[PDB]
């Protein structure tokens, strides 16, 4: 049950559970309810909500993201 800050978070390579690489996060967008993930895609760029429960893993020193988008969510807010 920890979750780390999410400005902290951005930058980090961010992927799903499943182990979809999405990216690299580049930034947090603060949401009503939270924030979400701006992650860099290969040649675009998605938006993913950030929360404790969908987040999977999180590697603070070896600069990297886990999570869990929810269906097709793992593309745009």
Excluded at 4 to 15: K, P, S, T
Excluded at 16 to 38: D, F, M, R, S, Y
């Amino acid at each position: 049950m920890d979750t780390y800050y999410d400005h902290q978070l951005v930058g980090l390579m961010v992927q799903t559970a499943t182990g979809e690489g999405v990216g690299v996060v580049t930034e947090v967008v603060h949401t009503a309810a939270g924030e979400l993930l701006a992650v860099k895609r290969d040649s675009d760029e998605v938006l993913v909500p950030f929360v404790r429960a969908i987040v999977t893993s999180v590697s603070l020193d070896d600069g990297i993201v886990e999570i869990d988008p929810p269906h097709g969510l793992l593309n745009l807010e």
